[PDB]
PDB file of C-alpha atoms in Angstrom:
ATOM      1  CA  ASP A   1      -3.918 -37.774  -6.944  1.00  0.00           C
ATOM      2  CA  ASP A   2      -0.605 -36.149  -7.859  1.00  0.00           C
ATOM      3  CA  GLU A   3      -2.197 -33.084  -9.432  1.00  0.00           C
ATOM      4  CA  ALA A   4      -4.615 -32.566  -6.529  1.00  0.00           C
ATOM      5  CA  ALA A   5      -1.617 -32.504  -4.163  1.00  0.00           C
ATOM      6  CA  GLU A   6       0.370 -29.990  -6.202  1.00  0.00           C
ATOM      7  CA  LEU A   7      -2.717 -27.806  -6.549  1.00  0.00           C
ATOM      8  CA  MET A   8      -3.286 -27.888  -2.795  1.00  0.00           C
ATOM      9  CA  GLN A   9       0.319 -26.790  -2.367  1.00  0.00           C
ATOM     10  CA  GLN A  10      -0.372 -23.852  -4.693  1.00  0.00           C
ATOM     11  CA  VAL A  11      -3.554 -22.874  -2.844  1.00  0.00           C
ATOM     12  CA  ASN A  12      -1.663 -22.792   0.449  1.00  0.00           C
ATOM     13  CA  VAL A  13       1.075 -20.596  -1.007  1.00  0.00           C
ATOM     14  CA  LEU A  14      -1.479 -18.278  -2.658  1.00  0.00           C
ATOM     15  CA  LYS A  15      -3.482 -17.902   0.561  1.00  0.00           C
ATOM     16  CA  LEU A  16      -0.269 -16.909   2.341  1.00  0.00           C
ATOM     17  CA  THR A  17       0.468 -14.431  -0.452  1.00  0.00           C
ATOM     18  CA  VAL A  18      -3.031 -12.919  -0.192  1.00  0.00           C
ATOM     19  CA  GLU A  19      -2.625 -12.399   3.566  1.00  0.00           C
ATOM     20  CA  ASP A  20       0.772 -10.799   3.065  1.00  0.00           C
ATOM     21  CA  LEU A  21      -0.374  -8.430   0.302  1.00  0.00           C
ATOM     22  CA  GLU A  22      -3.652  -7.456   2.006  1.00  0.00           C
ATOM     23  CA  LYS A  23      -1.874  -6.618   5.259  1.00  0.00           C
ATOM     24  CA  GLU A  24       0.735  -4.488   3.480  1.00  0.00           C
ATOM     25  CA  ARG A  25      -1.998  -2.814   1.436  1.00  0.00           C
ATOM     26  CA  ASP A  26      -3.984  -2.001   4.582  1.00  0.00           C
ATOM     27  CA  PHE A  27      -0.847  -0.747   6.344  1.00  0.00           C
ATOM     28  CA  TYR A  28       0.027   1.669   3.504  1.00  0.00           C
ATOM     29  CA  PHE A  29      -3.593   2.764   3.253  1.00  0.00           C
ATOM     30  CA  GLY A  30      -3.724   3.543   6.975  1.00  0.00           C
ATOM     31  CA  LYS A  31      -0.591   5.654   6.569  1.00  0.00           C
ATOM     32  CA  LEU A  32      -2.159   7.599   3.719  1.00  0.00           C
ATOM     33  CA  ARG A  33      -5.296   8.224   5.834  1.00  0.00           C
ATOM     34  CA  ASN A  34      -3.160   9.558   8.702  1.00  0.00           C
ATOM     35  CA  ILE A  35      -1.441  11.916   6.269  1.00  0.00           C
ATOM     36  CA  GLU A  36      -4.785  13.005   4.777  1.00  0.00           C
ATOM     37  CA  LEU A  37      -6.072  14.060   8.198  1.00  0.00           C
ATOM     38  CA  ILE A  38      -2.953  16.135   8.878  1.00  0.00           C
ATOM     39  CA  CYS A  39      -3.451  17.873   5.546  1.00  0.00           C
ATOM     40  CA  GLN A  40      -7.145  18.517   6.235  1.00  0.00           C
ATOM     41  CA  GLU A  41      -6.527  19.921   9.716  1.00  0.00           C
ATOM     42  CA  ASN A  42      -4.061  22.386   8.191  1.00  0.00           C
ATOM     43  CA  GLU A  43      -5.816  23.354   4.964  1.00  0.00           C
ATOM     44  CA  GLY A  44      -6.408  26.840   6.319  1.00  0.00           C
ATOM     45  CA  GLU A  45      -2.731  27.772   6.040  1.00  0.00           C
ATOM     46  CA  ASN A  46      -2.607  27.756   2.226  1.00  0.00           C
ATOM     47  CA  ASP A  47       0.673  25.838   2.193  1.00  0.00           C
ATOM     48  CA  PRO A  48       1.500  24.914  -1.409  1.00  0.00           C
ATOM     49  CA  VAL A  49       3.502  21.871  -0.274  1.00  0.00           C
ATOM     50  CA  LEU A  50       0.415  20.445   1.435  1.00  0.00           C
ATOM     51  CA  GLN A  51      -1.416  21.213  -1.804  1.00  0.00           C
ATOM     52  CA  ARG A  52       1.053  18.991  -3.683  1.00  0.00           C
ATOM     53  CA  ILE A  53       0.612  16.230  -1.098  1.00  0.00           C
ATOM     54  CA  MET A  54      -3.184  16.375  -1.239  1.00  0.00           C
ATOM     55  CA  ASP A  55      -3.029  16.261  -5.036  1.00  0.00           C
ATOM     56  CA  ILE A  56      -1.037  13.016  -4.730  1.00  0.00           C
ATOM     57  CA  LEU A  57      -3.441  11.504  -2.190  1.00  0.00           C
ATOM     58  CA  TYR A  58      -6.458  12.157  -4.409  1.00  0.00           C
ATOM     59  CA  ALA A  59      -4.969  11.161  -7.755  1.00  0.00           C
ATOM     60  CA  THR A  60      -6.046   8.065  -9.684  1.00  0.00           C
ATOM     61  CA  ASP A  61      -3.346   6.115 -11.502  1.00  0.00           C
TER      62      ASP A  61
ATOM     63  CA  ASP B   1     -11.282 -36.061 -10.109  1.00  0.00           C
ATOM     64  CA  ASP B   2     -13.591 -33.481  -8.554  1.00  0.00           C
ATOM     65  CA  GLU B   3     -10.988 -32.627  -5.913  1.00  0.00           C
ATOM     66  CA  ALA B   4      -8.291 -31.502  -8.352  1.00  0.00           C
ATOM     67  CA  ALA B   5     -10.988 -29.624 -10.282  1.00  0.00           C
ATOM     68  CA  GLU B   6     -12.223 -27.900  -7.129  1.00  0.00           C
ATOM     69  CA  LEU B   7      -8.664 -26.893  -6.201  1.00  0.00           C
ATOM     70  CA  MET B   8      -7.924 -25.596  -9.692  1.00  0.00           C
ATOM     71  CA  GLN B   9     -10.953 -23.320  -9.481  1.00  0.00           C
ATOM     72  CA  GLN B  10      -9.734 -22.129  -6.075  1.00  0.00           C
ATOM     73  CA  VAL B  11      -6.268 -21.496  -7.535  1.00  0.00           C
ATOM     74  CA  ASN B  12      -7.679 -19.397 -10.371  1.00  0.00           C
ATOM     75  CA  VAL B  13      -9.688 -17.254  -7.991  1.00  0.00           C
ATOM     76  CA  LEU B  14      -6.743 -16.764  -5.632  1.00  0.00           C
ATOM     77  CA  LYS B  15      -4.425 -15.819  -8.515  1.00  0.00           C
ATOM     78  CA  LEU B  16      -6.886 -13.125  -9.495  1.00  0.00           C
ATOM     79  CA  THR B  17      -7.090 -11.822  -5.931  1.00  0.00           C
ATOM     80  CA  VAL B  18      -3.297 -11.717  -5.784  1.00  0.00           C
ATOM     81  CA  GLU B  19      -3.031  -9.686  -9.015  1.00  0.00           C
ATOM     82  CA  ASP B  20      -5.541  -7.111  -7.741  1.00  0.00           C
ATOM     83  CA  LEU B  21      -3.873  -6.837  -4.341  1.00  0.00           C
ATOM     84  CA  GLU B  22      -0.405  -6.347  -5.844  1.00  0.00           C
ATOM     85  CA  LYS B  23      -1.763  -3.462  -7.903  1.00  0.00           C
ATOM     86  CA  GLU B  24      -3.520  -1.933  -4.902  1.00  0.00           C
ATOM     87  CA  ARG B  25      -0.449  -2.344  -2.699  1.00  0.00           C
ATOM     88  CA  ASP B  26       1.895  -0.759  -5.261  1.00  0.00           C
ATOM     89  CA  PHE B  27      -0.658   2.014  -5.954  1.00  0.00           C
ATOM     90  CA  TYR B  28      -0.723   3.079  -2.280  1.00  0.00           C
ATOM     91  CA  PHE B  29       3.026   2.551  -1.817  1.00  0.00           C
ATOM     92  CA  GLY B  30       3.643   4.724  -4.877  1.00  0.00           C
ATOM     93  CA  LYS B  31       1.663   7.536  -3.256  1.00  0.00           C
ATOM     94  CA  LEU B  32       3.630   7.267   0.022  1.00  0.00           C
ATOM     95  CA  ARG B  33       6.879   7.441  -1.965  1.00  0.00           C
ATOM     96  CA  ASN B  34       5.714  10.471  -3.956  1.00  0.00           C
ATOM     97  CA  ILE B  35       4.802  12.184  -0.693  1.00  0.00           C
ATOM     98  CA  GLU B  36       8.172  11.276   0.814  1.00  0.00           C
ATOM     99  CA  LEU B  37       9.837  12.941  -2.172  1.00  0.00           C
ATOM    100  CA  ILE B  38       7.887  16.155  -1.688  1.00  0.00           C
ATOM    101  CA  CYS B  39       8.877  16.157   1.984  1.00  0.00           C
ATOM    102  CA  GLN B  40      12.500  15.382   1.078  1.00  0.00           C
ATOM    103  CA  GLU B  41      12.766  18.386  -1.257  1.00  0.00           C
ATOM    104  CA  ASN B  42      11.446  20.821   1.356  1.00  0.00           C
ATOM    105  CA  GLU B  43      13.551  19.523   4.261  1.00  0.00           C
ATOM    106  CA  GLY B  44      15.216  22.716   5.476  1.00  0.00           C
ATOM    107  CA  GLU B  45      11.910  24.557   5.821  1.00  0.00           C
ATOM    108  CA  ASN B  46      11.443  23.812   9.533  1.00  0.00           C
ATOM    109  CA  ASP B  47       7.757  23.143   8.809  1.00  0.00           C
ATOM    110  CA  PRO B  48       6.218  21.233  11.745  1.00  0.00           C
ATOM    111  CA  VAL B  49       3.476  19.856   9.472  1.00  0.00           C
ATOM    112  CA  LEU B  50       6.041  18.216   7.158  1.00  0.00           C
ATOM    113  CA  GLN B  51       7.831  16.837  10.203  1.00  0.00           C
ATOM    114  CA  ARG B  52       4.601  15.177  11.328  1.00  0.00           C
ATOM    115  CA  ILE B  53       4.142  13.626   7.879  1.00  0.00           C
ATOM    116  CA  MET B  54       7.727  12.393   7.716  1.00  0.00           C
ATOM    117  CA  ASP B  55       7.353  10.677  11.088  1.00  0.00           C
ATOM    118  CA  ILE B  56       4.220   8.925   9.823  1.00  0.00           C
ATOM    119  CA  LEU B  57       6.148   7.837   6.706  1.00  0.00           C
ATOM    120  CA  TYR B  58       9.179   6.469   8.602  1.00  0.00           C
ATOM    121  CA  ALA B  59       7.571   3.068   9.208  1.00  0.00           C
ATOM    122  CA  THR B  60       6.891   2.740   5.456  1.00  0.00           C
ATOM    123  CA  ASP B  61      10.514   3.293   4.465  1.00  0.00           C
ATOM    124  CA  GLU B  62      11.853   0.892   1.841  1.00  0.00           C
ATOM    125  CA  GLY B  63      14.791   0.044   4.094  1.00  0.00           C
ATOM    126  CA  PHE B  64      12.399  -1.901   6.321  1.00  0.00           C
ATOM    127  CA  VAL B  65      11.206  -4.075   3.424  1.00  0.00           C
ATOM    128  CA  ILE B  66      14.408  -5.322   1.792  1.00  0.00           C
TER     129      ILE B  66
END
């Protein structure tokens, strides 16, 4: 009745939040993948800065 | 009745999804920021590879979020 309505309101807000977060997550992930490729295509130069970047990309937190 | 109960279950599942996504989003954003810092420190190196990475990062700048 009253609770079902407030819960529906919450579900709508949460679904909007999921869409928002997933899209931002995917966007940041795509950026990281682009950077990873650049690092891989240049791994033959032995650049220590790219080494630091790759270490970041492949680190678990 | 069953409606409110169905919605509550849906709410609990969505809340869990949200918590996982926030952690994934911040995890990836944290990496982009750490990479931006590395680039920032080595600015005056005239390294074309770092310039490519910085251009990729531009769209992820915090200034575009707040």
